[PDB]
From a paper:
Adult individuals with Down syndrome (DS) develop Alzheimer disease (AD). Here we report the structure of Aβ and tau filaments from two DS brains. We found two Aβ40 filaments (types IIIa and IIIb) that differ from those previously reported in sporadic AD and two types of Aβ42 filaments (I and II) identical to those found in sporadic and familial AD.
Western blot analysis of the sarkosyl-insoluble fractions from the gray matter of cases 1 and 2 using the anti-tau antibody HT7 shows the presence of tau bands with a migration pattern corresponding to 3+4R tau, with identical electrophoretic mobility in both cases. We determined the structure of tau filaments at high resolution by cryo-EM imaging and 3D reconstruction. Visual inspection of cryo-EM micrographs shows the presence of paired helical filaments (PHFs) and straight filaments (SFs) in both cases, identical to those of PHFs and SFs from AD and related diseases. We determined the structure of PHFs to a resolution of 2.9 Å and the structure of SFs to a resolution of 2.9 Å. We showed that there is no variation in the structure of tau filaments between individuals with DS and sAD (and FAD), and tau in other brain amyloidosis, further supporting the notion of a common mechanism through which different amyloids trigger aggregation of tau, resulting in tau filaments with identical structure at their core.
Residue numbers in the entry:
A (entry chain H), B (entry chain J), C (entry chain F), D (entry chain D), E (entry chain B), F (entry chain I), ...: 306 to 378
């Protein structure tokens, strides 16, 4: 068996921006209550229990490229 | 058996912007109550239990390219 | 068996920005209460229990490239 | 069996920015209460229990490249 | 069996910035209370229990490159 | 002229209570914005401009008696 | 002219209470913004401009009696 | 002219209480911003400009009696 | 002219309390910003400009009696 | 003219308390910023400009009596 894998990639993900400007993120805080008894978990688990988060994310370009290659014989 | 895999890609994902400008994110906070007894979970699990989140996301281009290649013999 | 793997990649992820500018992140704090009894967990687990986080993220370009290559014989 | 692995990569992740500017992160503090009884955990576990964190992250470019190569015979 | 692994990489992750500027991080302190009884953990565990942290991170470029190569015969 | 003023008062304002009990006042905070230019005021003026107040008032009897007597000749 | 003023008062304002009990006042903080230019005021003026106040008032009886007597000849 | 002023007062303002109990006042802090240019005031003026106050007032009886007598000839 | 002023007062303001108990005042701190240019004031003026105060007041009876007598001929 | 002023007062302001108990005052500190240019004031003026005060006041009875007598001929 002969396998040739050559996925040539010539590419760009780009952006141009003059300015981003005035960004105002001003939340009132609220209130979060979470009640549970038993938390049992495993094997690739991501969790958030009870939160009040504020995220301001202002990159000067946040261009993203995700690529995967899988060859299984 | 002979397999030739050559998916050539010449491409672009792009943007241009003069300015983003005045962005105002101003939430009142509310109230979140969550009640449970037993949380049992596993094997690739993502969860959020009880939240009050505020996200302001203003990238100067957030162009995205996702690509996957799978060859199974 | 003969396998040739040569995924040539010529690429760019880029951005240009004049200025980012005035960014104001001013949250009121709220209140978070979390109650549980037993936390039992294992094997690749990420968790946040009870939080009030504030993140301001302003990179002068936060361009990202993620790439994976897997060859299983 | 003959395997040749030569994933040549010619690439760039870049950014240019005139200035970042005036960034103001001014949170009110809130209040976080977390109650539990038994914490039992193991094998690649990351956790945050009870927090009030404030992060200001302003890199002059925070361009990121992540790449992995895996060959399993 | 013959295996040749030569993933040649010619690349750059870069940034240019005129100035970063005026960055003001001024949080009010809040209050964090965490109550538990038994903490039992092992085998690659990272944890934070009860915190009020403030991080100001302003690198003059915080460009990052992460790369891994794994060959298993 | 003869004026006799003798408004005799025999009275009670009273209360009895076993217990008041469990009182929970838990507001989410909201947001108040007030804009004006010129505030000009005088002669017995009470005012509140822009507020977010929370009052919990639980007296163990808050019985009130208000009485006024005015004789003008 | 003869004026006789004898407003005899025999009275009580009272209360009895076994217990007041569990009182929980737990507000999330919000956000208040007030903008003005000129504040000009006089002659018995009470004012609050811009506030976020939290008052918990739990007297073990807060019985009140207010009485005024005015004789003008 | 003959004026006789004898407002006899026999009275009580009272309270009895077994216990006051568990009082919890736990506010999240918010944020208050006040902007003005000129403050000009006089003649019996009380004011609060810009505040975030928290008052817990728990007297073991806060019974109050206010009385005024005015005779103007 | 003959004026007789004899406002006899036989009275009590009282309270009894077994115990006051567990009082917890635990605020998160917030943030207060006040901006002005000229403060001009006089003649019986009380003011607070910019504050974040926390008062816990727990008297074992805070009974109050205020009385005024004014005779103007 | 004959004026007789004899406002006889037989009275008490009192309290009894078994115990006051466990009082916990635990504030997070916040942040106060006050900006002005010219402060000009006179003639019976009380002021606080910019403060973060914490007062715990727990008298074993703080009963108060205020009385004034004014005779103007």
């Amino acid at each position: 068996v002969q396998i040739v894998y050559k996925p040539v990639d010539l590419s760009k993900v780009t952006s141009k921006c003059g300015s981003l400007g005035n960004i105002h993120h001003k939340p009132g805080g609220g209130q979060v209550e979470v009640k549970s008894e038993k938390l049992d978990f495993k094997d690739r688990v991501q969790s958030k229990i009870g939160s009040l988060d504020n995220i301001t994310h202002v990159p000067g370009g946040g261009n993203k490229k995700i690529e995967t290659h899988k060859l299984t014989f």
